Amino acid sequence: RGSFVEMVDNLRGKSGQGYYVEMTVGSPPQTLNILVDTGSSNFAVGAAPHPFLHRYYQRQLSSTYRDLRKGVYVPYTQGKWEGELGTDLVSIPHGPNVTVRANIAAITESDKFFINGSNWEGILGLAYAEIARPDDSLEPFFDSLVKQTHVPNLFSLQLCGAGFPLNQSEVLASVGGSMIIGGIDHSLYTGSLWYTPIRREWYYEVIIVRVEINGQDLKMDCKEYNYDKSIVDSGTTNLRLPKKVFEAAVKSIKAASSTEKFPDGFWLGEQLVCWQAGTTPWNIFPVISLYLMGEVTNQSFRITILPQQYLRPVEDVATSQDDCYKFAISQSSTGTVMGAVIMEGFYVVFDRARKRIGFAVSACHVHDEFRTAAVEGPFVTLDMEDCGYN
Template structure:
């Protein structure tokens, strides 16, 4: 839905005034037997038909990573191909690869060794929530091992400088953004990699992601982060029935820039936080695989922390504020104590005008396994709180996505969630996996439609004053001239009054 802003209303008013003045001037300057000018108004509507196609029945794990450092996929770039790993990020749109040495990475793309590299001569700067980079825009050939026999020329930013962007233990050397072109840098005019694949007809306009998180918890008696790698699967153009179980629940994409969706409520142990639903979406809610935590606006975050604290059921439990802020690690000798002592957290998403569904996260998801910084060899289970405060809206990051199979159905402008077939984080004694429930009916559908946050334009007041002042000045300047022209036209059409022979004679002599 495109919202109408006050500046646009003012612009339309100004345009209307200009049209009226123009019409009056045409009337005034038209000969007595004036002609009629007809303006044709064109109204177009584009219809697009989509076919569902069949689900892919073959899905091999092609995503890898380390806990808290993101998921990457291998790509072949250039001619001859150079193999590099790139972070999969649904929260950005640029495709960027390291093209110069950096202390945090072991390899980079050598532009001078690719015969298909074509520089555009344009620089680009991209900042993230943490870190930034600067690069040179160019194009080159790209293929993925998971998409055999498919090669596409893609726009790529080749990174020449970065700050706090690369992670020396992550094993990825670039990033590929899967969000919409509108947020691509520098000005929304760089075609994203996935858009290029769709445009050339290689894949359907959808993709799906299964993030399985840290697997050491399921297979080790103690948390050994040296083997605590993450795996997952990404399918471009398809959905695999082997990656989910049960039904797929879809929520509409509210706006196509980030993958923006709308939350209707948040529960802790089935108890609502009871906030205005706009607070959950302040100033947007996005699904972002490139962000580790579930991030919430500060007011929502504080309410959730208080509710979780009130419901923790662990004997002699104590934690400082640093644990809830995500900066302190807490360790327990066994998983059962942790996973049965913390409450569930549920996020409700709009389904239709009056229905919604809930994504329920267990402690297995929002308690993020980490290494004890004071004793890396410690035998036990150490965690950070995987829910954090945000100043840039709600972010449904990897902590939430790891509980589900997520389908980015761009064809139908919706995002699907289904229960994942990833191995459980703990043993069967630690409880079930995260669940989806619904659909539920909301009695007041108007309330749900109002949950999306509408950002006010702080410039409305000043723009309104400027617009009215300019309109007034224009009117004062044009009015005398308009009156004179109209009087002249009237006199020319009707002739001079009787008795005014001097002017008549002058006109005849001419």
């Protein structure tokens, strides 16, 4: 049974551009599309004209707006935003039937933040206060929602990748998945949910205990997999791996697929590869399994993704009927990031109340008739806390 019909299919967008939910801010309500980001903790919206914004938050038009008289500056690797802190009334039209007074960063300047044609105007940081800017005293949206309402302290995400390119028109008209606020919808997954502990409440931090490529153990010291952390992050496209893990994984993926040779630019994520329509050789590419620490002592489980997850469909540079893709596994110097590449395979339950993350095979994951994504267990694994980096 699906018990959250109101919230099923409330997401739009794709990998590379981002999955967003409709929200309203202010009185009278101002509608905005908001990127869902489990990898940050600020609620921040465009609040001034920008070339890539079709609309923005107008604080002067909101009778319920409150100025906190405080600036916020958020530099990150590939860009930045800055703005002014305030509070206002916020609702999610395809969400729980509640209105909350939440912190809002009104973005007045940004660099490489807004994406042309993504159709979103702001970001919903769903992680914990520890990583909020300017500091942990700025209560994140979800904490406000839970404190002010009877909504259970849990949300779940089904991100639905298309498996083929969507153009401007198609992304608008299409369903990109579900964010179920306050519950778990049984219609969004098949098989069992398996839970991994949230190691610490800042990012959604987890512990990977083993990595396999087509069943072959990558055979690295498990600390390497979590150096300097492993996180579940809907605001990142790629599966991102620590440098040494990336090198080892790519060598193994190349060996598994060695019946075809791909240029270095492909493996670096820089260059697309194209096949004649319908002929993508999925079967030459390996499955990838991540083993996660279980809830029971000395137990683990595994999640397994297909090339249909880690090869990202792209529109051809020279318009044709070819099926074209980029490699969406990449190097990290900030630990493992389980981005949309992982998340598109799975229904992911962010069980904040019980400090755990649940995984189940997504009812919308892309596959062929020969192989599917999997969530399987249990496995007997030892010394797993040792896999955590300090």
